[PDB]
């Protein structure tokens, strides 16, 4: 387990967000990419707007953010950038649905998005279980997710990192509950059933936000919506994040090929020219239904759906040669 230096986190308190970014950041399609220096600062900003400059000890929060950064590997997609990008989507979702979630959920969810893909190796769940890592020998299903959460718990229990320490012991244990499901929910495998359920519940109108496991479901769906929001950005941003996703996929594939194994088309750099078709497949079978269902449960979230539709037709053009 790994911690941060005093220098780094003290550099975090001085930071103040450049005034031009205040309007732009509220936008769902906002892109954090041109502002690396500022990524940990932006998180702070978003928590500060989300629930005040005193929902957390300032000093104690900066420690955490920077340790979390320390525990993102220098991988091309599942890295510090994806952590924050995801966190920003959740921020915008909470900001647009002001009175739907409890203070506890709000903090809970922003913290879970930041740690969602913690200490990620660049390897899929399939890959680790398939052959035949110690991380898959501990956690059988949702292999990388459990690690992600475990990493999270550990960082919290470090020396004065425990941003949740002031709370009651039942609020503490409970925000951790909220955090856990959320992260686990980022396992794309689990998304399909979950969404299917919510779709049914909404159709019959049995969906109840007073129901605890309905909440958990809705939140899951929100996490998924957040994990995937490269697709919700402006086309030129979506393109480049696309290049980061495949770099990681193909390296995984390259490990399958180093042992004679055909990696499935997604992970196969020999299957480059099939990428646009892949994206369209993915928007249709995954992205669109995610945002469609979510927009339905939470109308204010619509701009995400709009932007997904926009990009999907761009891939079309790409495929059709234009
Ligand atoms: C933002 C984003 C894009 C994306 N694309 C994928 C894979 C989609 C895909 N491409 C393929 N190419 C060839 C064969 C199959 N596929 N399937 C998985 C993701 O998590 N994301 N996230
Ligand atoms: Mg994950
Ligand atoms: Zn993720």
UniProtKB/Swiss-Prot annotation:
Tell me the protein family, please. Belongs to the cyclic nucleotide phosphodiesterase family.
- Which residues bind 3',5'-cyclic AMP per the record? 78, 279
Q: What is known of its domains?
A: The tandem GAF domains bind cAMP, and regulate enzyme activity. The binding of cAMP stimulates enzyme activity.
Name the UniProt record assigns to this protein: cAMP and cAMP-inhibited cGMP 3',5'-cyclic phosphodiesterase 10A
Catalytic residues (positions) = 78
Q: Which disease appears in this protein's record?
A: Dyskinesia, limb and orofacial, infantile-onset: An autosomal recessive, early-onset hyperkinetic movement disorder characterized by axial hypotonia, dyskinesia of the limbs and trunk, orofacial dyskinesia, drooling, and dysarthria. The severity of the hyperkinesis is variable.
Ligand binding (3',5'-cyclic GMP): 78, 279
Describe its partners and assembly state.
Answer: Homodimer.
Tell me where it resides: Cytoplasm, Cytosol
Q: In which tissues is it expressed?
A: Abundant in the putamen and caudate nucleus regions of brain and testis, moderately expressed in the thyroid gland, pituitary gland, thalamus and cerebellum.
Q: Which amino acids does the record list as binding a divalent metal cation 1?
A: 82, 116-117, 227
The UniProt function text for this chain reads:
Plays a role in signal transduction by regulating the intracellular concentration of cyclic nucleotides. Can hydrolyze both cAMP and cGMP, but has higher affinity for cAMP and is more efficient with cAMP as substrate. May play a critical role in regulating cAMP and cGMP levels in the striatum, a region of the brain that contributes to the control of movement and cognition.
Lineage, top-rank taxon, reads Eukaryota
- Coverage span on the entire protein: 715 to 1035 of 1055
Provide the species name. Homo sapiens (Human)
Q: Kindly list the positions annotated as binding a divalent metal cation 2.
A: 117
